[PDB]
Coordinates of C-alpha atoms in Angstrom, one line a residue:
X1 CA 0.2 0.3 0.0
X2 CA 1.0 3.6 0.0
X3 CA 2.6 6.0 2.5
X4 CA 1.2 8.6 3.7
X5 CA 2.8 12.2 4.0
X6 CA 6.6 12.1 5.4
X7 CA 6.4 12.9 9.1
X8 CA 9.7 14.5 10.8
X9 CA 9.2 13.6 14.2
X10 CA 8.4 9.9 13.0
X11 CA 11.6 9.8 11.1
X12 CA 15.7 9.9 11.8
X13 CA 18.6 10.1 10.9
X14 CA 22.7 8.9 11.0
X15 CA 25.4 9.2 10.4
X16 CA 28.7 6.6 9.6
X17 CA 30.3 5.4 11.7
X18 CA 31.7 7.9 14.2
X19 CA 34.9 9.8 14.3
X20 CA 35.4 9.8 10.6
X21 CA 39.3 11.8 9.9
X22 CA 39.1 14.8 8.4
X23 CA 39.4 14.9 4.6
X24 CA 37.6 10.9 5.2
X25 CA 33.8 10.7 3.9
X26 CA 30.9 9.5 5.8
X27 CA 27.7 8.2 5.4
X28 CA 24.2 9.6 6.0
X29 CA 21.1 7.4 6.6
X30 CA 17.8 8.9 6.6
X31 CA 15.0 7.0 7.5
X32 CA 11.9 8.3 6.1
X33 CA 8.2 7.5 7.6
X34 CA 5.0 8.4 7.9
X35 CA 2.9 8.6 11.0
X36 CA 2.0 5.4 11.0
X37 CA 5.9 4.2 11.2
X38 CA 5.2 2.8 7.6
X39 CA 8.8 3.8 4.8
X40 CA 7.9 7.0 2.9
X41 CA 10.2 6.8 -1.3
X42 CA 9.3 8.6 -3.9
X43 CA 10.2 11.8 -2.1
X44 CA 12.7 14.9 -3.9
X45 CA 14.2 15.8 -1.0
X46 CA 16.3 18.8 -0.8
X47 CA 20.6 18.2 0.1
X48 CA 21.7 17.0 3.2
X49 CA 22.1 20.4 5.1
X50 CA 25.5 19.9 6.6
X51 CA 26.6 22.2 9.7
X52 CA 29.7 22.6 13.2
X53 CA 33.0 23.6 12.3
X54 CA 33.8 20.4 10.1
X55 CA 31.1 21.5 7.6
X56 CA 33.4 23.7 5.9
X57 CA 34.9 22.0 2.7
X58 CA 32.4 19.2 3.6
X59 CA 29.9 18.3 0.3
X60 CA 27.8 16.3 0.2
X61 CA 26.6 14.2 -2.9
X62 CA 22.5 13.1 -3.7
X63 CA 20.1 11.1 -1.7
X64 CA 20.1 7.2 -3.3
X65 CA 16.1 6.3 -2.2
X66 CA 16.8 2.6 -1.4
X67 CA 13.5 1.9 -1.6
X68 CA 12.7 0.6 2.1
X69 CA 12.7 4.1 3.5
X70 CA 15.9 4.1 4.3
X71 CA 17.4 7.4 2.2
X72 CA 22.0 7.5 1.7
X73 CA 24.3 10.2 0.7
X74 CA 28.0 10.3 1.2
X75 CA 29.9 13.4 2.5
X76 CA 33.2 14.5 0.8
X77 CA 34.7 15.9 4.4
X78 CA 37.4 19.3 5.1
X79 CA 39.9 19.7 6.5
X80 CA 38.6 20.9 9.3
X81 CA 38.3 18.9 12.4
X82 CA 35.5 19.5 14.5
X83 CA 31.0 18.0 15.5
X84 CA 29.4 18.0 12.2
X85 CA 25.4 17.2 12.0
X86 CA 23.4 16.7 9.2
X87 CA 19.6 17.6 9.1
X88 CA 17.8 16.1 6.2
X89 CA 15.2 18.4 4.8
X90 CA 12.3 18.6 2.3
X91 CA 11.2 22.0 1.3
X92 CA 13.9 23.5 4.0
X93 CA 11.8 22.3 6.3
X94 CA 13.4 19.5 9.1
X95 CA 13.0 16.0 8.2
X96 CA 13.8 13.9 11.3
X97 CA 13.1 14.5 14.7
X98 CA 16.7 15.4 15.7
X99 CA 20.2 16.3 13.2
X100 CA 22.5 13.1 13.9
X101 CA 26.1 15.0 15.2
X102 CA 29.9 13.5 15.2
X103 CA 32.8 14.3 16.0
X104 CA 35.4 15.3 13.3
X105 CA 38.7 14.2 14.5
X106 CA 42.0 15.5 12.7
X107 CA 44.4 13.2 11.1
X108 CA 47.9 11.8 12.3
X109 CA 50.1 14.6 15.3
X110 CA 52.7 16.3 12.2
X111 CA 55.6 17.0 13.9
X112 CA 56.0 19.4 11.7
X113 CA 52.5 21.6 12.7
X114 CA 53.0 20.6 16.6
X115 CA 55.1 23.3 18.7
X116 CA 56.8 22.7 21.8
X117 CA 58.1 26.0 23.9
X118 CA 59.2 26.1 27.3
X119 CA 57.7 29.4 29.7
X120 CA 62.0 30.7 30.8
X121 CA 64.8 29.3 28.7
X122 CA 67.0 30.5 31.4
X123 CA 66.3 27.4 35.1
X124 CA 68.6 27.8 38.3
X125 CA 69.3 24.5 38.8
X126 CA 67.2 21.9 41.2
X127 CA 63.9 24.4 39.5
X128 CA 61.4 24.4 37.4
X129 CA 59.4 25.4 34.2
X130 CA 57.0 24.0 32.1
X131 CA 56.8 23.2 29.2
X132 CA 53.6 23.6 27.0
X133 CA 53.6 21.0 23.5
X134 CA 50.6 22.4 20.8
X135 CA 49.4 19.0 19.2
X136 CA 48.5 19.4 15.5
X137 CA 47.4 17.3 12.4
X138 CA 48.8 18.9 8.9
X139 CA 45.7 21.0 8.6
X140 CA 46.3 22.7 11.8
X141 CA 43.8 20.7 13.7
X142 CA 44.3 20.6 17.2
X143 CA 44.9 17.3 18.8
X144 CA 43.3 16.0 22.0
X145 CA 42.8 13.3 24.0
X146 CA 46.7 12.6 23.4
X147 CA 49.4 10.5 25.8
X148 CA 52.6 11.8 26.1
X149 CA 55.5 11.8 27.5
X150 CA 59.0 13.4 27.0
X151 CA 63.6 13.2 25.8
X152 CA 65.6 14.7 28.1
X153 CA 68.7 15.5 25.8
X154 CA 72.4 17.5 26.0
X155 CA 74.9 18.6 29.1
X156 CA 72.4 19.1 31.8
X157 CA 69.5 16.3 30.6
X158 CA 71.5 13.9 33.9
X159 CA 69.0 14.1 37.1
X160 CA 66.7 16.2 34.7
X161 CA 62.3 14.7 34.5
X162 CA 59.2 15.6 33.0
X163 CA 56.5 15.6 35.3
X164 CA 52.7 14.1 33.6
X165 CA 51.0 15.6 31.2
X166 CA 48.1 18.0 31.7
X167 CA 45.3 18.8 28.8
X168 CA 44.4 22.7 29.2
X169 CA 41.8 22.0 25.9
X170 CA 42.6 22.4 21.9
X171 CA 45.7 20.8 21.6
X172 CA 46.6 22.4 24.7
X173 CA 49.2 20.5 27.0
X174 CA 51.5 21.0 30.2
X175 CA 54.3 19.8 32.1
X176 CA 56.9 20.5 35.0
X177 CA 60.7 20.6 33.9
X178 CA 62.1 20.1 36.6
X179 CA 66.0 20.5 36.4
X180 CA 68.5 18.7 38.3
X181 CA 72.7 20.0 39.8
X182 CA 74.1 19.8 36.4
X183 CA 74.1 22.7 34.5
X184 CA 74.8 23.0 31.0
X185 CA 72.6 22.3 27.8
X186 CA 69.4 20.7 28.2
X187 CA 66.5 20.0 25.7
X188 CA 63.2 18.7 25.8
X189 CA 61.0 16.8 22.8
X190 CA 57.4 15.4 24.5
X191 CA 57.2 12.6 23.0
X192 CA 53.9 11.1 21.7
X193 CA 54.1 6.9 21.0
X194 CA 57.1 7.4 21.9
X195 CA 57.7 9.2 18.9
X196 CA 59.0 13.1 18.7
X197 CA 56.0 15.3 18.8
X198 CA 57.2 19.2 17.5
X199 CA 59.6 19.9 15.2
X200 CA 61.6 20.8 17.0
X201 CA 62.8 20.0 20.9
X202 CA 62.7 23.2 23.2
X203 CA 66.7 25.2 24.5
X204 CA 67.1 25.6 27.8
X205 CA 70.0 26.7 29.8
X206 CA 70.6 24.9 33.1
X207 CA 72.7 27.9 35.1
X208 CA 73.9 27.9 39.4
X209 CA 70.9 27.5 41.6
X210 CA 70.3 29.3 43.9
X211 CA 73.7 30.7 46.4
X212 CA 74.8 28.7 49.5
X213 CA 75.9 30.1 52.2
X214 CA 77.5 27.4 53.8
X215 CA 79.1 26.6 50.3
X216 CA 80.4 29.9 49.4
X217 CA 83.2 32.1 51.1
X218 CA 84.1 35.6 52.1
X219 CA 88.4 36.3 52.7
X220 CA 90.4 39.7 52.6
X221 CA 93.9 40.1 51.2
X222 CA 94.6 41.3 54.9
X223 CA 93.7 39.9 58.9
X224 CA 94.5 43.2 60.4
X225 CA 94.3 46.2 58.4
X226 CA 95.0 49.6 59.5
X227 CA 91.6 52.1 60.6
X228 CA 90.9 54.5 57.2
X229 CA 93.1 51.6 54.6
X230 CA 92.3 49.7 52.3
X231 CA 91.7 46.1 51.8
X232 CA 90.9 43.4 48.9
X233 CA 87.9 41.0 49.5
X234 CA 87.3 37.9 47.5
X235 CA 84.0 36.7 47.7
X236 CA 84.0 33.4 45.8
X237 CA 79.8 32.8 45.4
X238 CA 78.3 28.8 44.7
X239 CA 74.9 27.2 45.1
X240 CA 74.0 23.6 47.2
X241 CA 75.6 21.3 44.9
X242 CA 79.2 23.3 44.2
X243 CA 78.2 24.7 40.5
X244 CA 80.1 28.5 41.1
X245 CA 77.1 31.2 40.0
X246 CA 78.0 33.7 37.7
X247 CA 76.5 36.7 37.1
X248 CA 75.0 37.3 39.8
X249 CA 76.6 41.0 41.5
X250 CA 76.1 40.8 45.6
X251 CA 75.2 44.3 47.1
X252 CA 76.7 46.5 49.7
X253 CA 78.1 44.4 52.2
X254 CA 76.9 44.9 56.3
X255 CA 79.5 46.3 59.2
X256 CA 78.7 45.3 63.1
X257 CA 81.0 45.3 65.7
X258 CA 83.7 48.7 67.3
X259 CA 85.4 48.6 63.4
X260 CA 82.1 50.1 62.7
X261 CA 80.6 52.9 64.7
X262 CA 83.4 55.0 64.3
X263 CA 82.5 58.7 62.4
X264 CA 83.8 57.6 59.1
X265 CA 81.7 53.3 58.9
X266 CA 83.7 51.3 56.3
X267 CA 83.0 51.2 52.9
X268 CA 82.7 48.2 50.2
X269 CA 83.7 49.3 46.7
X270 CA 81.8 47.8 43.7
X271 CA 82.5 43.6 43.1
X272 CA 84.0 43.1 39.3
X273 CA 83.9 39.2 38.6
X274 CA 87.6 38.1 38.0
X275 CA 86.7 34.0 38.2
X276 CA 83.8 31.5 37.5
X277 CA 81.6 32.8 40.9
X278 CA 84.5 35.3 42.0
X279 CA 83.7 38.9 42.8
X280 CA 86.3 40.8 43.7
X281 CA 86.4 44.5 45.7
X282 CA 88.4 47.1 47.3
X283 CA 87.8 47.6 51.6
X284 CA 88.0 50.5 53.1
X285 CA 88.5 51.1 56.6
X286 CA 86.6 53.3 58.5
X287 CA 88.3 55.8 61.3
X288 CA 87.7 53.3 64.2
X289 CA 89.9 50.3 65.1
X290 CA 88.7 47.5 67.2
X291 CA 86.5 44.0 65.4
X292 CA 84.9 44.1 61.7
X293 CA 82.1 41.5 61.5
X294 CA 81.5 41.4 57.1
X295 CA 78.6 40.1 56.2
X296 CA 78.2 39.3 52.5
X297 CA 74.9 40.1 50.4
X298 CA 73.5 39.0 47.2
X299 CA 69.1 39.1 46.6
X300 CA 69.2 41.2 50.3
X301 CA 70.5 37.7 51.7
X302 CA 73.4 37.1 54.0
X303 CA 75.8 35.2 51.8
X304 CA 78.0 33.1 54.0
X305 CA 77.6 30.6 56.7
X306 CA 80.1 32.8 59.4
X307 CA 81.3 36.6 58.9
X308 CA 85.0 37.7 57.8
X309 CA 86.6 38.9 61.0
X310 CA 88.6 41.8 60.5
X311 CA 91.0 43.3 63.3
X312 CA 90.5 47.2 62.4
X313 CA 94.9 48.4 64.1
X314 CA 95.0 51.8 65.3

């Protein structure tokens, strides 16, 4: 017998498969029925209606009437990943109860389009920085849900580690890179299925750690200088691992004791780094004789365990 008019509330649409890849194909299967659930054939349907991010550049063939109430169309997908919503239409009106929805997935990870970056390109020994991976396919689609690892290379890779990765959405992933006690060059390559996930490794320099007052020393060329004369100060600065702390100018030292109390106070001149982590300054003694305690300062902190003690001669 002849079926009644198409009824959208009794009709449906399916897309097969779910998760097709960009540039691939997806099949649309529209089940057309009347209000008595009888199949509907011999219609003149409009072209399939495509929406969502993945509809861009996607094209549909005409609908094939299978003679059983099912109508099939092939969709050639564009290169944009994301949601694809498909609704059949008859004279501009919806011809199914709901649109069919799939996620069109990005293609294989492209090392050329993907990028790795480090928040700081100089990191102090023992400290950490953030590594960011932006993972993409050849068309520039962001790749979600990746399981990642990392490869560390270079002089400073021994003792350095990378944490678990955190996905931040839109194919962005972050991890913590912790350096160890070894200074020098370090390169980080995020890995996907054991292969490089980026064009080139992010590069950083591991520099000396925070200064260690226990490993640092201050000496003078004369332990008994006369009032108002000078003595050369030699300040050797190291981190907790014994690395020399280079390129870091100390502050003015702090003076206490009898020899710091005269009308003329002792004063240290500018520090010059003359050796690797070795800073030299000229100390001009004050007008008062007696014991002088000299405490070097670096970034507002005491730079040695115990002060240099001088006995200033009258």
